[PDB]
């Protein structure tokens, strides 16, 4: 999280339920003005800080991009490790072959994948109660009203809904008394049968759906520009038409791509599983469909031949078994 | 080591000396020259690895202990083979752990694991 | 009173005629709702302190693994209880579980989530449908030098970029088949007694 | 039959109490009639019996309605690529005709050698 | 819902005859 700091330069103190004091570090980024950051992985940074007793200063990314190959050169966060403006990357950054040939990754924080987020627009009382269905109701009562003294005139209406002799007519009424039951019995199951029509909410079941492989102008697909999902779709020749024309709808950041979905302006959003699932919990009006298809994790990137290669990948590996990475999970991700 | 879904060993169909084609020869190195051949999820990865980068392998099964343990300061099992320079590579069902990874270098994990509990359906 | 009960000089007879119509609507609408209607993990007290809460609870795990080491150094209270109900081999740990001796088995995830997904299924379900404790992965083991460490990782990572890794578990790890209204009745019966 | 027994046992206990407070087999005659599809103080207190009679018939119809919803729940085979097909169960048998096209079809693929 | 009107027609002819 990134929030502006107070007037005095130290941002406001928060106390989640019991919680203990919330841990906040002063981020200095975009000109440039200081801020303060709350963090899931920042609570992980402060843990690594005390173990190897190294001090730190945190500054935001210059351009807000994750990183990819330009033209011959890297951009975003990767453009600041190689150059020398940073010695570590504490942010959700997936592991893949292209990045692994230039930096070192350690072991993942958490294991996840990536999915697709779409609208969850999920909305008659008696739809068939019209046309001949309603017309036949009036005809039956009117015909029997003068079938044959006025006591039986209201009898037909009352006998239709529970309740309130002329020999042949008495038997005729008796046999017709059960006739009202069968006709209304179908009505009871008519709406019951009409209650299971449902709607096609299975808009996109993974990549292998025919809509993705054959994109139509009705559907608009998007991701975040210069990220790992962009790389994943430029590795496969059979998907050369996937983003041949759907590349121009790529969004700048995942913060505003989700807002586009809720504005009925975007139809599909492909991004990390650990992020979209959390958003679906808060919003309570979106949904994630499909299945995970590229399983990797978030690791601490650090420049090649760095002398902290073994230290970091052991504390992360130990923290899973202590339960520390589960205490963070409940306080930050899976609560509601 | 033999794990039923991941590494499967078979008597190699002792007709003359050979078994089915989707298998690789194995051994039961101990210190009866029976020959057996193995297949599974892990071995399929091993065959693909040996093709992209050129090398040859000599699979043998561990007859001392199991996946790995340290009793009285001595490692026994798959980790004890790599630790004592008895093999250049251990494959199968090994879980990345704090104590092993400080003695033996691991690689990128294949699949997720951990600890879970099962119960009879009622 | 009688007119209101029936819901559940030719002057008031009109509305009771309309009132009877509503009766069929309430019952019919109820059909739509019903037509479409059709020991946890390690965190709870049942595991750490089984004796105090429910003595009838049995556990176990093969005692030379990583789960045994993780449990021993993390929950020392429950480790000394599993020594008596110890058992070797996973296959022998399912016959006893099905017979009625043990109640839960503690082991890995990739093995248990597949054995319960195989023909051995239809009777065994993992308590954590997607819940795993102390999550890790597999991997190769090399020496400290490990000249082959660098080329292997890149080879393993480019498999993930393609479909090669996730077309392998679909070949080897696939499988198939992965009184009661007393409170409502008692409350309803009790409510009418007061009136 | 536990559900029927529990509901069946409730008619005798409930009806007796209402008649005694409002004051034999004639009293049970009224209860039986309401139990099928057919004084003032006990009227309002006893009127909820029709609701009590309404819930039981509704529950059985609800239970019976969903009984046929799961029509033919057993799935036999989905075709090729069945996990049972690829991995034999040592009990569910496969066979074909010797020396035909199916022998050639299954003999040219390595991953089907099991 | 043509069958529903058929039952009424049969019912109507039942008493009329
Ligand atoms: C971190 O790793 C370095 C290199 O192996 C080592 O010198 C240092 O002692 C390690 N830190 C701790 C706390 O063990
Ligand atoms: C676990 O290791 C001990 C070491 O002494 C051994 O005696 C025991 O049989 C082993 N149990 C297994 C492999 O199930
Ligand atoms: N996969 C574990 C063994 C299974 C267990 O005991 O949990 C290991 O290699 O250490």
Query: What distance in Å separates the CA atoms of residue A66 and residue A86, rounded to the nearest whole number?
Result: 14
CA of B71 to the centre of ligand 2 (A): 11
User: Which atom of ligand 3 has the smallest separation from the CA of B115?
Assistant: 7
Look at C34 and D62 and tell me if their CB atoms are within 8 Å. yes
Q: Which residues of B are annotated as a binding site for L-glutamate?
A: 93, 95, 100
Q: What are the tokens at A129?
A: 């109660």
Residue C136, ligand 3, Cβ within 6 A = no
Contact between residue A298 and residue A94 where contact means Cβ atoms under 8 Å apart? yes
Chain D residues inside the 8 Å CB shell of C186: none
CB atoms near residue D97 (< 10 Å): 8
- Neighbouring residues of C188: CB distance < 8 A, sequence distance ≥ 6: D48, D51, D52, D55
Q: What are the tokens at A137?
A: 């109701």
CA angle C170, A112, A43 (to 5 degrees): 160
Scanning every residue of chain B, which has its alpha carbon at the shortest distance from the alpha carbon of D107?
A: B21
User: What's the gap in Å between the CA of A172 and the closest CA on chain E?
Assistant: 6
Query: What distance in Å separates the CA atoms of residue A205 and residue A288, rounded to the nearest whole number?
Result: 10
Quote the DSSP letter at residue A237: G
CA of C174 to the centre of ligand 3 (A): 21
Minimum CA distance residue for ligand 2 atom 1:
C64
Q: How was this structure determined?
A: cryo-EM
Greatest Cα pair distance, chain C, in angstroms, is: 106
Q: What are the tokens at C122?
A: 């239809």
Nearest to A217 by CA among A250, A247, A245: A245
Cβ-based contacts under 8 A for chains C and D: 61
Q: What are the tokens at A335?
A: 């609560």
CA angle C150, C153, C158 (to 5 degrees): 130
Contact between residue B112 and residue C135 where contact means Cβ atoms under 8 Å apart? yes
Using alpha carbons, list the distances in angstroms from residue B56 to B59, B85, C143.
10, 18, 18
Q: Resolution in angstroms, to 1 decimal, for this deposition?
A: 3.4
Nearest to A215 by CA among A235, A234, A242, A233: A242
Physical contact, B and E (3 or more Cβ pairs within 8 A): no
Query: Long-range contacts: D100-109, Cβ < 8 Å, 24+?
Result: none
A105 phi/psi in degrees, rounded to 5: -120, -20
Nearest to A271 by CA among A115, A95, A119: A115
Contact between residue A74 and residue A282 where contact means Cβ atoms under 8 Å apart? no
- Neighbouring residues of B1: CB distance < 8 A, sequence distance ≥ 6: B7, B61, B62, B66, B67, B77, B78, B92, B93
User: Which ligand has the minimum distance to the alpha carbon of residue B70?
Assistant: 2
Query: What distance in Å separates the CA atoms of residue D26 and residue D32, rounded to the nearest whole number?
Result: 10
Q: What are the tokens at D92?
A: 């569910």
3-state secondary structure of D33: helix
**Helix, strand, coil share of chain A (percent; to 5):** 35, 15, 50
Quote the DSSP letter at residue A151: G
C142 phi/psi in degrees, rounded to 5: -130, 175
Nearest to D86 by CA among D110, D50, D52: D110
- C108 known ligand binder: yes
- A92 known ligand binder: yes
Strand ranges (DSSP E) for C14-167?
Answer: 105-107, 124-126, 133-137, 141-142
The 10 Å CB-count burial string (b at 16+, else e) for A91-110 is ebbbbbbbbbeebbbbbbbb
Q: What are the tokens at A155?
A: 């009898």
* Substitution site in A311, A313, A318 for ligand 1 pocket (most atoms within 8 Å of beta carbon): A311
Angle between the C182-194 and D2-22 helix axes, to the nearest 10 degrees?
A: 0
User: What's the gap in Å between the CA of C66 and the closest CA on chain D?
Assistant: 30
Q: Rg (Cα) of chain E, in Å, rounded?
A: 8
Query: What distance in Å separates the CA atoms of residue C168 and residue C117, rounded to the nearest whole number?
Result: 16
Strands A268-272 and A221-222: parallel
Query: What distance in Å separates the CA atoms of residue B29 and residue B39, rounded to the nearest whole number?
Result: 18
Query: What distance in Å separates the CA atoms of residue A72 and residue A83, rounded to the nearest whole number?
Result: 14
Chain C residues inside the 8 Å CB shell of D40: 1
- How far the first Cα of chain D sits from its last, in Å, is 49
Chains that touch A (3 or more CB pairs under 8 A): B, C, E
Nearest to A56 by CA among A318, A319, A312, A322: A312
Dihedral class, residue B114 (left if φ above 0, else alpha if ψ from -120 to 50, else beta): left
- C67 known ligand binder: yes
Query: What distance in Å separates the CA atoms of residue A254 and residue A259, rounded to the nearest whole number?
Result: 9
């Amino acid at each position: 999280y990134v929030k502006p700091t107070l007037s005095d330069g130290t941002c406001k103190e928060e106390f989640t339920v019991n919680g203990d004091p919330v841990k906040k570090v002063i981020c200095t980024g975009p000109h440039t003005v200081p801020q303060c950051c709350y963090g899931f992985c920042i609570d992980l940074l402060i843990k690594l800080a005390r173990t190897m007793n190294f001090t730190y200063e945190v500054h935001l990314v210059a351009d807000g991009k994750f990183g990819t190959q330009e033209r011959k050169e890297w951009n975003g966060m990767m453009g600041e490790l190689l150059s020398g403006q940073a010695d570590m990357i504490v942010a959700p950054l997936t592991i893949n072959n292209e990045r692994a040939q230039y930096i070192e990754f350690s072991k993942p924080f958490k294991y996840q994948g990536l999915t697709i987020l779409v609208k969850k627009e999920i909305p008659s009382f008696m739809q068939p109660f019209q046309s001949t269905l309603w017309l036949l109701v009036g005809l039956s009562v009117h015909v029997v009203a003068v079938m044959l003294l006025s006591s039986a005139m209201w009898f037909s209406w009352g006998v239709l809904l529970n309740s309130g002799r002329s020999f042949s007519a008495r038997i005729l009424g008796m046999v017709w008394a059960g006739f009202a039951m069968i006709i209304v019995a179908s009505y009871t199951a008519n709406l019951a049968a009409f209650l299971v029509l449902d709607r096609p909410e299975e808009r996109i079941t993974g990549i292998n759906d025919p809509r993705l492989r054959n994109p139509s102008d009705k559907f608009i697909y998007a991701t975040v520009k210069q990220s790992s999902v962009d790389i994943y779709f430029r590795r496969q020749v059979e998907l050369s038409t996937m983003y041949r024309h759907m590349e121009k709808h790529n969004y700048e950041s995942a913060a505003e791509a989700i807002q586009a979905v809720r504005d009925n302006k975007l139809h599909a959003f492909i991004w990390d599983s650990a992020v979209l699932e959390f958003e679906a919990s808060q919003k309570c009006d979106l949904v994630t469909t499909g299945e995970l298809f590229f399983r990797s994790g978030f690791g601490i990137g650090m420049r090649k031949d760095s002398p902290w290669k073994q230290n970091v990948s052991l504390s992360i590996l130990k923290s899973h078994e202590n339960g520390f990475m589960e205490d963070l999970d409940k306080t930050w991700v899976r609560y509601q | 080591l033999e794990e039923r879904p991941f590494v499967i060993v078979e008597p190699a169909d002792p007709i003359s000396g050979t078994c089915i084609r989707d298998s690789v020869p194995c051994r039961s190195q101990l210190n009866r020259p029976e020959k057996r051949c193995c297949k599974g999820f892990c071995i399929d990865i091993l065959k693909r690895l040996a093709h992209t980068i050129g090398f040859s392998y000599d699979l043998y099964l561990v007859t001392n202990g199991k996946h790995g343990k340290k009793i009285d300061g001595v490692w026994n099992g798959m980790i004890g083979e790599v630790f004592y320079q008895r093999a250049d590579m251990a494959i199968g069902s090994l879980t990345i752990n704090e104590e092993r990874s400080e003695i033996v270098d691991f690689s990128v994990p294949f699949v997720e694991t951990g600890i879970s509990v099962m119960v009879a359906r009622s | 009173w009688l007119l209101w009960a029936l819901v559940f000089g030719t002057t008031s007879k009109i509305m009771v005629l309309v009132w009877a119509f509503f009766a069929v609507i309430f019952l019919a609408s109820y059909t739509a709702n019903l037509a479409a209607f059709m020991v946890s993990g390690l965190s709870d007290r049942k595991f750490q302190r089984p004796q105090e809460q429910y003595p009838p609870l049995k556990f176990g795990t093969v005692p030379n693994g990583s789960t045994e080491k993780n449990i021993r150094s993390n929950y020392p209270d429950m480790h000394s209880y599993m020594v008596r109900y110890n058992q070797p081999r996973v296959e022998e740990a399912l016959t006893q579980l099905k017979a009625g001796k043990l109640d839960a088995f503690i082991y890995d995830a990739a093995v248990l989530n597949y054995m319960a997904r195989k023909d051995e299924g239809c009777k065994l379900v993992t308590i954590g449908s997607g819940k795993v404790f102390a999550t890790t992965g597999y991997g190769i083991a090399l020496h400290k030098g490990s000249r082959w460490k660098r080329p292997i990782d890149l080879a393993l990572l480019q498999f993930l970029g393609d479909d090669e890794i996730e077309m392998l578990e679909r070949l080897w790890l696939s499988g198939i088949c992965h009184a009661g209204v007393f409170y409502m009745l008692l409350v309803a019966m009790g409510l009418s007694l007061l009136v | 039959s536990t559900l029927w027994l529990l509901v069946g046992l409730s008619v005798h206990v409930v009806a007796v109490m209402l008649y005694l407070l409002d004051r034999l087999s004639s009293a049970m005659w009224f209860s039986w009639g309401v139990l099928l599809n057919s004084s003032f103080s006990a009227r309002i207190l006893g009127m909820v019996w029709a609701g009590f009679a309404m819930i039981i018939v509704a529950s059985y119809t609800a239970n019976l309605a969903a009984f046929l919803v799961l029509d033919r729940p057993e799935e036999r085979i989905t075709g090729i690529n069945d996990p049972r097909l690829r991995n034999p169960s040592d009990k569910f048998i496969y066979a074909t005709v010797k020396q035909s096209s199916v022998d050639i079809y299954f003999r040219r693929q390595v991953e089907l050698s099991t």
